Each structure stands twice: as structure tokens, then as C-alpha cells.
Amino acid sequence: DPSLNNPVVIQATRLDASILPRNVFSKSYLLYVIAQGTDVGAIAGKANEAGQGAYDAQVKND
Amino acid sequence: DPSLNNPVVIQATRLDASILPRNVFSKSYLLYVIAQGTDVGAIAGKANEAGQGAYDAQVKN
Amino acid sequence: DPSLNNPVVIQATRLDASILPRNVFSKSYLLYVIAQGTDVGAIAGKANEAGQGAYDAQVKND
Amino acid sequence: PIQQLPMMKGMGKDFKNADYIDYLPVNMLATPKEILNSSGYLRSFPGITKRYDMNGVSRGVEYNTAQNAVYRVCGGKLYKGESEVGDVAGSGRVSMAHGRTSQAVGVNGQLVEYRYDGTVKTVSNWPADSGFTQYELGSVRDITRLRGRYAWSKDGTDSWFITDLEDESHPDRYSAQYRAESQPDGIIGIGTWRDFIVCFGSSTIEYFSLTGATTAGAALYVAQPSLMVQKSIAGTYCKTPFADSYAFISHPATGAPSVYIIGSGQASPIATASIEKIIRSYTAEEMATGVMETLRFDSHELLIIHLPRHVLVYDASSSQNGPQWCVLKTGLYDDVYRGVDFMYEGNQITCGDKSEAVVGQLQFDISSQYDKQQEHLLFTPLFKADNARCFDLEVESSTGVAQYADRLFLSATTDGINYGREQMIEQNEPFVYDKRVLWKRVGRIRRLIGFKLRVITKSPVTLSGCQIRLE
Amino acid sequence: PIQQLPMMKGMGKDFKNADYIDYLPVNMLATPKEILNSSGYLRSFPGITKRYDMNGVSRGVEYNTAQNAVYRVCGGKLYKGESEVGDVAGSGRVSMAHGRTSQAVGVNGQLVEYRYDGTVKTVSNWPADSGFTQYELGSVRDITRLRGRYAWSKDGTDSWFITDLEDESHPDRYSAQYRAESQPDGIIGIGTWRDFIVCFGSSTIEYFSLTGATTAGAALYVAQPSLMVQKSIAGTYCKTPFADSYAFISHPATGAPSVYIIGSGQASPIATASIEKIIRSYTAEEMATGVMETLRFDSHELLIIHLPRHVLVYDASSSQNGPQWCVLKTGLYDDVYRGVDFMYEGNQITCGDKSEAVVGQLQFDISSQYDKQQEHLLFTPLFKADNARCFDLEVESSTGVAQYADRLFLSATTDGINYGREQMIEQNEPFVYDKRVLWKRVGRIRRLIGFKLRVITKSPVTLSGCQIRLE
Amino acid sequence: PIQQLPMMKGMGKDFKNADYIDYLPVNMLATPKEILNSSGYLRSFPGITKRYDMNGVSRGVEYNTAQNAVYRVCGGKLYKGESEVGDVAGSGRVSMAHGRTSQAVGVNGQLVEYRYDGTVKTVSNWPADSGFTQYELGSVRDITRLRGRYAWSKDGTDSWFITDLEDESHPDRYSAQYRAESQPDGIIGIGTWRDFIVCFGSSTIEYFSLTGATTAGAALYVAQPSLMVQKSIAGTYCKTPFADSYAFISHPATGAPSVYIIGSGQASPIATASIEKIIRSYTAEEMATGVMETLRFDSHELLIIHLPRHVLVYDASSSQNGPQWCVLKTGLYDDVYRGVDFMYEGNQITCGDKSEAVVGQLQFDISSQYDKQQEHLLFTPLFKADNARCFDLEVESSTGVAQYADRLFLSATTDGINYGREQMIEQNEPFVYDKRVLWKRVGRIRRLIGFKLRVITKSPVTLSGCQIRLE
């Protein structure tokens, strides 16, 4: 129950696309990499919101 | 309460071993990138299912 | 409700930084990939904990 | 001084435009295989011998993996190898997809399924009393199969559908319809690449993957923006799998049409400027009517394009120096190559005929098409040799597999457009393996010269290296 | 001028169609190792000496890791090394997989488990009264073991099953059945790579990994579309692990067959054009009857293909210049190599016999097979030397290990197809280590010449560098 | 003409098989250090001088990081440097791991912990009345330590256990047992790499990492399929850390045994064909009895393999041209090198003795082993010089650090197997630093020649560059 309170910390929010090896990765792979960074951020946000909601439901039901 | 309703959108589903610099990454890292894509999909599914369950419990409560 | 029971499995827990390329990736991206593996692990843990909490709240409410 | 003359590609001038076009070999295949003093050798395209008769011209072919047999549509009839299994309407080309339950043919805007049990079922909406979702199917343009679902594109619209899993005859119960709406482009053609449904549009190419959603009415397919390609195909059948990817002819919307290969969300051209000029020579409608396919025998990975007046073959194996393109033609004149719809079927390569109602198999022993003489041409690049006399013109040729002695016509051009007199040389002789093909006293080069080799034969032509003694 | 002549590959012309084929060494192996003036040397394939008798011809072999012994099925009997431990029906080749509990043999469409306690169990559905799920097993084609589960493929269908952990005799209680439904291709063969169950189809190759789901009825395996390969295997036993991957022969469905190596979701050909022609010469069924395996001794990593009439060996170690292929044959004529089912077993490499009911060990001391003479051939490429006389033809040979003096037949061809007179040369002598193999006054080269070395011996042949004095 | 002759590798023929094998330097080390006209120089392996006595032969060694001292087991006694701290049963080699609380030795299938307080505790199941989970420990094969837990492998089974954190004597309370069940392979050896527990099997190598789960009964370790290696180790002690990785001898299950280095989930061979033949010469059991270790002094990173009859040293520092292998031997004949279990301990490298019950330190001043003469050999590659006379044979040598004058034996071979007469040359002289080692009038080379240098001394041998005046 109390574990559902604290959110889990996240890494750097985004990839700058200037630190990527642009001479190596294909541009589709580049798009995938930035999309993966953004999607990890979004999934972290959604998981934290769901944990907050679960904690609130748990305490209200208690 | 209502923010738990809408699912979060996701990126492309997977790394289909044709955009990877397959002459650069080692075998372990080459497996790791697809493993990470599949696991990101799985974690997205689990997080959305947990959000749906939390919303249902909240409204029922 | 029963779907919230089983946690979703995880990939390899972390990047070793010895299997990554090191003449290609810059220092920032080399840090980012490791932090991304760690954050994927942490997000998996948080999502599983939130699913467990949601299941417990759901069954107690039922 | 002995100078070697390459024969893979020949320089020249276009008399209509005075532009430097690149003359291509005719019915002649380049093989990058080190032998004698040359890095590669030129071998004639395999000849065609009739296998068995059909009714009507060829309209499509595919290898039915489930049945382990080749299904091809000739005329108004559908053939499973030798045998006949169904009736097909229409007269134009058709696109076919096959599944475990049935073999499907897309004809007359309808997806016709020829089930292996003998029954014929046509794709149509679910019955009204069933209560399932109804869709405006319209007309079918192109079809494909993936994961047991027949995927087809609505004609004149960017919408495509997928059939239901339990019943392949009807579309999906709840989530059949999908749209490639990244750009307002009509889906010209549809195809399958790996586990992605590819929607070739008029301006963009999109990739769709299975979501795995189990909820009723949820979308099963979502577009993959990372793999989108900003090019597009020109005609419905201007696409084909090639080199673990898709090769296509660019639509006029994105500019002058050209041949491209899709790689990692980007299109890399493989068309020489001469090839692009040839493609541009056709009208938009004629370009749309063109069809291309892939053929792979020996080490060659050929991309064959059946344009209305030309047949172009791209050899990926022999493209080390650059894009190697060949022209395939039938007869002494410039008639279009008659073979079409090549497919490898159990030790034989079977090809339909564009004109006659027969199907023939590729025979490597001979070079004649249906027991008819064929023309083989090789052009050397124009090279500037001033006041230089060239005497010994020798080309290495493999001989001894001809039923009659061959004659090689050798001619040289000075302007680069008009060729001089042709000299007959005994190129081949039956049961002779050590014959030398050589001509002495070529002449004196005033400003520049180029050589053209012409062979008329029913036997394979193998020319290795053209060397000339300048002095 | 002294010019060195390579012997790893030989040029030539096919008399059937005048095409340039690559003559391959017979019963010889190339070693990329710098000695004297040559970057490599050619050594004869190790000879075979009989180890102990069996009943019937060889049908399979595998290294049972659990028992730390070699299990092979010869004729109608199953052998654990020297001893006999079980009875096997049928007559064709069998696919075997091994586990901690039992050793499994896939024969006659049944997965037969030979338990180490002595009892024999055959895979069948769970009893009806047990209440577990019932499946339509059909017939078993190929089997494999992973994570304590036997995985086998239904014959004629793309469905495969996995045995239960507690009772390996019966399939899994709730989630046994799985399908490779990305394409409508029958699962010709099944294999294991890393932790993935690899389902080699007739059109595509798919990878399945453990989900780890704990819920009853949930799928334990999901396909990995990322690692999918768009090629496929020609026959059931046309696959084998090779270089931390799988090597296979392409199915005719994807085009002309060729030898490929699976890498990171992509198939890279390793077959020379001549090898592809040789493979294409066979029919579909004959190729399907072919079996391939891998053998590794010394620095060589060999890929052996047992085609019905030819045996092709691909040496990955000596393939720097290009794909190095060698042909293995038994006897003076073109009979197929008798050795089959090679497996390294405790300081010895034991191989079954295709014809006789014996098993023999590879002995490096001698080159004879079951105390019989063998032919060793080396072909030099055709090179064009006009009006050039060659006198000194010397090859350095290691000697002193032969039980009798060996004779080398040296002959030269001019047209590339027909060879001239053969000259007898004493290339080996017992207990002599400084003998020189040399022939003077070879002759005069009119247009082009090629050399062929023929050795008949019971002792190893080591030819390093062929140099010739052009003058 | 002055031609330099390399001495890092020597060419020759194996008289039993007539194959070209590499003659390796004996008791010499290659150093890639530019000096004079040579890119490198050859130096003799450091000699051994006795440090202090022991009881019994050496059986194991490791650097106890917690105590900052070297623990080694000689005979039936356990030694902490000079002192004696416990009693060890058995007679064979033992694998030891150390922790903060205790130093552990794996002997007679039991994990014996020698606690620093003086008490001795043996690993065994928890008491029955405690209520904790009971396991079938069986016998212990190999042990290791990670995160305060002693990890050991059950003998003859793929199961391994970990000790409890609070009490290291007993296994973990709830989640001790784990299995490397990717393949039915017994865990031959276990080791620690970075934060992964490595389970070296008989066919596969697996990596296990801490899950961090806090629930009682939850698995603490899960396999990492991404890092799995499809090779394996031949024997229990055929593994050792090397170059931030593990080096091992391949098990016979995967083919002919060979030396490999694990890199990024793949095994890269570092064994020359000669080394692989040497390894294959031994039987499977003798191969299993082999032990390997690593030693690093100066710039050399050496991988020492103590096979029953040969001792092979792989120098990673001097492997620029290729895998550099050296043979270490003791005595005038081919006796096995007596030094074993090297470990750097505070300015000295201490090594146990295979035969005598002593421990000695490596002294770089001298090359004698326990004050006994040693043989140093250097072989030059066979080179083909026809009708060529060679006169001046000079090798640069560092001198002046010998207590007695040295004699160098120079001999030449023509067949490559048998050497001619040996000529004595004054290689070294006390307190002389400008002596030149040179021999004039070597002779006339008929076909090919090779040189072998033999030195018998108690002093270091340093040979820089072998130049010969070929004329």
C-alpha cells in the first residue's frame, strides 16, 4: 500500500538526436530511437498515474 | 479518476532487424534491442491493464 | 480482474556496457542506453506493483 | 598496345536529342566471374521451349506454398500446374494471393477465392441478419494474404479491408476497414513484407502491423510511421518483392518516374539515367499498365520490368561497377520479349507467353525462344583514339554446343549513332571447343569509334573479353 | 618468368551448355596457412577405418549431452556408442533430440522416447479421463528439445506442439499447440537456436521464444517477427547448426535453391554459381531426400551436404577469397562419398556408412576409406597464354608417411573440356621426406591451357603450391 | 642480399601425418617491442627459485582480497602465504572461493569453509526443526562467490545452489536451488563474471543475474538468454578469467576441442591449427584433467594451459600477427613444466610445483628452475631457397648477466623433420655486453632449409633478430 505512493525515478527524458551516431543508424532507426525515448517517458507517466490511482482506491476502500 | 481511462499511445511495435546497424552491434546487443522493443510493448500492455483495473476499482468504490 | 494477477515478464535486466559498441556511441549516449535499461527495469517493477495494488483493491471492493 | 574493351555497357548518342545515352546489351546477361583476362563474362539469356498448351495469354502466377504447386491464370482459365481447376473472368492482369483454405484471384474488382475442395466463393459483406458490421467494399484493386487474412484494397480509395479469420469469404466481423490516411493518396497497390501489410499509395508507402488487440471492434492494424516511405508506385502491378524488400517504379506525383528499392524507410534509386529516360518515354497510362516481377537462377538476381514496348532486366549480382541493366527482346526486330510471369517450379523455370496461348520452360541448353532465332547484341563504349590504327579484334567465346554454325556480325560506328558495314565471323561451330573469334585489320580510327556485336542463333552465346590491339 | 598457379578452384566449361563452371577439388581441403611461397596448401580429406560393426545403414547421429555419449541409429537398431540400447523401426533418416529424462527419436511419424531406465514411451494425447486438453497430433516430421520440452512439428501442417514438463510422454496440458502462421507454409523442419524454437517453413523461417506466462491455457511461446527470415529449407534434413547459426538449402518456393546462412534475420548466400547449378541439377524430390550436417576438425569448419549423387563440403576457414567448396567421393568413379553422420566422440571422429552396415572413425594418418584406394583431384584455372612455352611444372609435396610409393597423373587441357595424355609421376615415396614433384617440358600453349592433377593412393596427399615457368 | 628470419613461429612437418605444423618456441616469450632492425625480440621465461617448503604438491591458489593475502592448498594442508591455517582432505585439484567471513575450498564434493576465526564449517542443509526448505545438495563440483553468497554446482546435474546471507554455512532459506536448463547439459564448472553467475555447461554457457526480489521463496537469479554462449568447457578446471572475459577449452560435444575467448555472447577461437591438433592428441579424460590459469607480468598477458603432457602459453600482448603460442617445459627432455598455480603476491610471483612439495618465486634475473639447467628453443620457418648459398647467420643477443658462459647449438633441417649436425656457439659470457653471436658459412640450400636454435643455460636468454646473408 505505501509502496504505491512514491513514483519511480526516470532517466533523461529525451534523446537529443545530436548525440546519436547519425552516420551509423538508419534514419528510420533514428526515428525509432527518439520515438522509444518519448514512449518510455509516456509509459513512465502512465504507470505512475495508475499507481497513484490504485493507492487512492486502496485507501478509500480501507 | 478520468485520466486512468485513456490509454497511452505507443511507438512502432518492434525493431524488425532491417533498420538496425547489424554490422555494428554485437550478437548480444542485437538480441537486446528486439528484446527491449518487445518488453516495452509488454510493459505498455501491463500498465494500460493496471490503469483500467484501477479506474474500475475507483468508480466501483 | 484475473489478468491483473500475473506480472509481465522482463527482458535481460541490464546492458553490460561491454556488449555495447564503444567506438561509435558517445559518452552521453553510452550513459543513456544504460540508464534506459535500468529505467525499463524500474518501470516494469512499478507497473507490476501497481497491477498488484489494483488487483487487491478490486478483490477487496468485490 | 593491347587494350581491353568492356562490353557490359555501351556509350552512344540519342539521335532525337543528341544526349549521351547508354546502350544496353540485348538478350545478354553479365556474370561477374573472374575468368581468363576478364573480370566477368557475358552469357545469353536462357531460351524458351514449350512445356504444354494453355487457353489465352498469361495473366498471373504465384507459388502456392500451401499446396506446393504453381498456380497461374492463362486467359479465362485458372491452372494448377498442368491441370485446370477453375474459371476466371476478365481479360487483364490479375493479382493472386493464397492461403491454407483457398487460392484467391483478384479479378474484375472482386476477390474470388478458389477453394481447394472445388467450391468458389466471392468476398462480400456479411448477411444483414447476422448483425455484424457492414462495410462499403466497392471494387477490389490488389490483394494479399497475411496471418490467414486476405487483405485487399478498395479501388479508387485509400481504404483497405481484411477478411474474417473464421470465415475467409466475408470481411472481418468488427474491424475490417483501415485507411492509409497519412497523405490523401489512393492505395494503388497492396503487398506483404515480413509481418507488415504494405499499402503502396500514389504518393506515400505505409506499413501496418498487427496490434494483437482482443477487444471486439478494436483496431487490429496500426500504421508504422517509422517505416513510411515518401515515394510511391506508378501502376497497380509496378511492385514486386526483391532482395528482402520491394522494388517499384516511382509514381509521377513525386517527379519523373524511376526504379527504386525500399530500404529502412528510404528509397534508393537503382535506375541509370538512360533507364530513367526510357521510362519517361512512355505515357502515364502506359507506365501504369507496366508490370514487373523477379527471377532468380544461378547467381543472378534479376528484376524484370515488362513495359509496353521495352523489357528491362536489372541484375543485382553483376552491379558492382554500377546498375547493370539489360533489354530482353523477341525476334529480329524490336518486338517486346514474349516470355512473362517467370516462376521456378521443381527443377524448371516456367514462363507464360504475352502473345500466344502457351506456357514454356526456360532451357539453358539453347537460346531460341519456341524454336525461333533470337538476336543478341553487345555494345562497347565510345572511346577517343586519334589517328590510331586498331588491327586485332578478338573476343573469347565458348563453342561446341550449337546444332548449326553461328555467324557473328561485327560493325563499328564513328559518329556514335550510325554503324558501318557488318562483317560476318564464324562465332560458333558444332562440336568445336577451341575455335577463336578474331578479326584482323579493323581500320583506322579518325576521332572515336565504338563496336557493336550481333549474333543470330538458336544456341547459347558466351562472350568473355573484348581486346583490341591499338597501334 | 615463374608464375604461380592456384589450385583452390579450377576454371572450366560445361560440355552440356558451354557455360563456365568452377571445377572443384575432389577429396581435398584448402588450408589458409602461409608456407614456403604459397599462402595456403591443399590436404587430402582424412581416411576412414572401420571401428565396429552395425546392423543396417546409418540413419542419424547426435551427441547426447546428458549421457555424455554419442547416440546413433543404424538400420533397425539404436546404438549408444559401442552398445545397443533400443530398437527403431522404419528405413529412412530419423531426427533425434535428447533430454535429461530420455533420448527421443522421430520415426514413422511418431516421437519415440528411449528412456535411460530401459522403458520406451511413445508420444500420445492425454487420457480422456485425465481431463486435460486433447489435440490432433497427426504425424511427426521433425523433433527438437528445449527447456526440458520436446518440440515436434505436425506433418503437412504449420502446427507444432511441446511436451509437458512433468510427463514428457504426453504433450502440454493446456498450451501444447502452436502455429507458424505468418505465411501459409508447412513447417518442413524444426530446430533450436539459443533459447528460440526455430520453425523452418516452406517459405519463411520463424523464431519462437518462451513467454513465461504462468496462467493455465496461456501461450508459452510467441513468434518473434523481428528475427523472421523470408527464405526456407528445401527438405526436412536440409538444415544444420553452423557458425553459431543455421545453414540451409533454399526451398524452390523462394526461387532457385541455394545454400544460405541465417544471420540476424537475414539469409546470406554462401553458394557459388557452380554450386547453385549443381544443386539445381537435381529434382525437387531428390533434393528433399538430401541431408546436410557440420563437421569440425583442426582449423576447418566444414559444412557437408549429402546430395543424392554429389557430396559438397564448404570450408568456412579457407573462404577468405570466396566460397571454397570441395567435392567428396568414394572410389575411382563418381560414386557418392560413403561417409555420413559425422560426430566427434572422445579423440575420434566416427562416421556412419551410406551403403555398408558399418561405422568407421576418421583417421588422419591415412587417406584410404575402409582400406580402399581413393582419388584426389586438383584443377588449376584456365589462363590465356598465347604462343608461350611452359617447361617447369613443380608442386611441393609432403612425403614419407606412405606405406607404398604413390603415383601422380598430370594432364593438361587446351579447350577446357577434353584433357590430353596423362604423365605418371612418383609424387610420394615411403620414408623419403625430400622428394621433389616436378615435370619438365610441359609443352607449348597455343591459346589457353589448364592443368589437372590426379592422385590414386591410400596415403594422405599434401600439395602446396603449383608454379610454372613461362618462357 | 640480407634476409631477416622471424623466430616467433617455426614451420615444419609432422612425421606421423606429414602435415604442416607450427614449431613453437620452448621456454621463450615474444615481446612486440621495436629494437634495432626487428619489430620484436624473444626472451626466455623467468626462472623459478625456491621460496619455502610445503607438504604435498600444489592443488589450488587464489588471492584472498578480504585478507589481502594469497591462499594456496598444497598437499593435505591449506596455507595462508607462509603460515598454515587448516587441513584439507583429498588429493586432486580443488577450486576455492573467498568471502568476508571465510575462505572456502571445494574438496571431495563438499564446500568446506575455513573461517578466519579458526573454526571450520561444511555446507549442509538447514536443520529439520528449523522449518526452512530442504534441498538435495548431492556433491559439489565447482564453487564461486558473489554478493556474499557462495555459489556451487551439484555434481553430475545442471542444478546449482547459493548459500544464505545471514548464515553462509547453510544454503539459502527459500530460493537456494537454480537450474541451467536451456539445454540438457550438466554444469561442468561455475564462475563469476562482473555481476553475473556463469554456469559453464557441457554444451552451453549461461549467465545469471540478481533479480532483487524481496518476496520469500521468489527466485533471486534468472538466466540472461542474450548473453548465452553455445560453446562449453571440456573440463572442470579448463576455464579462467582472461582479458575481462573467460577463456576455455571447447567441450567435445560441440566438436573438436579448441581454445576460445568469450566475447559479447560469442566464442572467438584463439587456437592455431597446430594448437588444436595438440589438444586433439589427448583423450577426453586427459583433456578433462587439464587445468588452465592466467598470469600477467610486464606487458605480457599470458594464458597458461597445463595439459597432462604439454604446457601451452598464449601471449595476448604479442598476438598482433596472429595467435602466439609458446610451450613451457622443464628439463633437457620433454618433461612437463613443473611450475603451476602462478599468483602475483606483493612484488613476487609465487608458483607451486607439480612434482615436488615446494613453492617457488619467479625470478627474472635467472632462467634456471630450482637451480637446474633449462632448454630454450627457437625455430625459424621453412623457406624455399633453390641453389642459394647462405653464409652469415647472426642473431642479436643481450649478454653479461650469466654466472657462466653459455653455448648456443645451431642446426639446420632440409626435409623439415630431421635436423643436421649442431654447432656450438658462445652465446653468453659473464660481464661481457658487446659479444656478437654469429656463424659464417652455413652451407648451400638445395631445396629448402629451416634453422633451430638450442640454448642450455641457467641465465636469461634474449634473442632479438635472426638475419641471414643469402647469396
mmCIF file of N, CA and C in Angstrom, chain B residues 10-20 22 49, chain D residues 193-196 209-210 224-227 244 264-265:
data_model
loop_
_atom_site.group_PDB
_atom_site.id
_atom_site.type_symbol
_atom_site.label_atom_id
_atom_site.label_comp_id
_atom_site.label_asym_id
_atom_site.label_seq_id
_atom_site.Cartn_x
_atom_site.Cartn_y
_atom_site.Cartn_z
ATOM 1 N N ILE B 10 1.692 4.377 -28.176
ATOM 2 C CA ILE B 10 2.993 3.721 -28.158
ATOM 3 C C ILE B 10 3.682 4.003 -29.489
ATOM 4 N N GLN B 11 4.995 3.785 -29.546
ATOM 5 C CA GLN B 11 5.758 3.942 -30.777
ATOM 6 C C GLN B 11 5.530 2.755 -31.700
ATOM 7 N N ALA B 12 6.375 2.621 -32.719
ATOM 8 C CA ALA B 12 6.343 1.441 -33.565
ATOM 9 C C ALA B 12 6.520 0.183 -32.714
ATOM 10 N N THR B 13 5.956 -0.920 -33.207
ATOM 11 C CA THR B 13 5.783 -2.103 -32.369
ATOM 12 C C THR B 13 7.115 -2.767 -32.029
ATOM 13 N N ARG B 14 8.068 -2.772 -32.959
ATOM 14 C CA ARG B 14 9.272 -3.567 -32.762
ATOM 15 C C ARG B 14 10.364 -3.100 -33.714
ATOM 16 N N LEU B 15 11.570 -3.613 -33.479
ATOM 17 C CA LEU B 15 12.720 -3.357 -34.337
ATOM 18 C C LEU B 15 12.887 -4.562 -35.253
ATOM 19 N N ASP B 16 12.505 -4.422 -36.518
ATOM 20 C CA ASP B 16 12.406 -5.607 -37.368
ATOM 21 C C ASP B 16 13.704 -5.896 -38.117
ATOM 22 N N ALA B 17 14.821 -5.899 -37.382
ATOM 23 C CA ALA B 17 16.116 -6.414 -37.828
ATOM 24 C C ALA B 17 16.494 -6.005 -39.247
ATOM 25 N N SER B 18 15.993 -4.861 -39.704
ATOM 26 C CA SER B 18 16.341 -4.335 -41.013
ATOM 27 C C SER B 18 16.692 -2.858 -40.958
ATOM 28 N N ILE B 19 16.320 -2.165 -39.886
ATOM 29 C CA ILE B 19 16.784 -0.809 -39.625
ATOM 30 C C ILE B 19 17.984 -0.783 -38.697
ATOM 31 N N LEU B 20 18.318 -1.901 -38.069
ATOM 32 C CA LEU B 20 19.443 -1.974 -37.147
ATOM 33 C C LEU B 20 20.760 -1.920 -37.911
ATOM 34 N N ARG B 22 23.238 -3.754 -38.332
ATOM 35 C CA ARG B 22 23.529 -5.132 -37.962
ATOM 36 C C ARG B 22 24.989 -5.515 -38.159
ATOM 37 N N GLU B 49 -3.443 -2.167 -18.689
ATOM 38 C CA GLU B 49 -4.365 -3.047 -17.974
ATOM 39 C C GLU B 49 -4.498 -2.640 -16.511
ATOM 40 N N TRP D 193 5.133 -7.558 -46.572
ATOM 41 C CA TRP D 193 6.572 -7.576 -46.341
ATOM 42 C C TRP D 193 6.817 -7.996 -44.903
ATOM 43 N N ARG D 194 7.437 -9.160 -44.723
ATOM 44 C CA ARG D 194 7.687 -9.736 -43.397
ATOM 45 C C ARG D 194 6.329 -9.873 -42.712
ATOM 46 N N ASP D 195 6.110 -9.260 -41.553
ATOM 47 C CA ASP D 195 4.810 -9.282 -40.901
ATOM 48 C C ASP D 195 4.074 -7.955 -41.015
ATOM 49 N N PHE D 196 4.452 -7.111 -41.969
ATOM 50 C CA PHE D 196 3.805 -5.824 -42.181
ATOM 51 C C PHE D 196 2.957 -5.872 -43.442
ATOM 52 N N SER D 209 1.133 -3.083 -38.929
ATOM 53 C CA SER D 209 1.462 -4.273 -38.163
ATOM 54 C C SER D 209 0.306 -4.635 -37.241
ATOM 55 N N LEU D 210 0.235 -5.914 -36.883
ATOM 56 C CA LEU D 210 -0.846 -6.394 -36.033
ATOM 57 C C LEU D 210 -0.697 -5.841 -34.623
ATOM 58 N N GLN D 224 2.832 2.193 -39.110
ATOM 59 C CA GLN D 224 4.152 2.344 -38.516
ATOM 60 C C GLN D 224 4.819 3.555 -39.146
ATOM 61 N N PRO D 225 4.762 4.731 -38.520
ATOM 62 C CA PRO D 225 5.346 5.923 -39.153
ATOM 63 C C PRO D 225 6.844 5.832 -39.360
ATOM 64 N N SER D 226 7.543 5.028 -38.557
ATOM 65 C CA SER D 226 8.993 4.943 -38.682
ATOM 66 C C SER D 226 9.410 4.328 -40.010
ATOM 67 N N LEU D 227 8.596 3.432 -40.560
ATOM 68 C CA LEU D 227 8.933 2.736 -41.794
ATOM 69 C C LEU D 227 8.284 3.347 -43.027
ATOM 70 N N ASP D 244 14.895 -9.122 -50.305
ATOM 71 C CA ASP D 244 14.317 -8.954 -48.972
ATOM 72 C C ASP D 244 13.722 -7.556 -48.809
ATOM 73 N N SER D 264 14.900 0.411 -45.292
ATOM 74 C CA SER D 264 14.844 1.059 -43.979
ATOM 75 C C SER D 264 14.128 2.405 -44.041
ATOM 76 N N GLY D 265 12.930 2.410 -44.617
ATOM 77 C CA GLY D 265 12.150 3.627 -44.693
ATOM 78 C C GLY D 265 12.662 4.660 -45.668
#
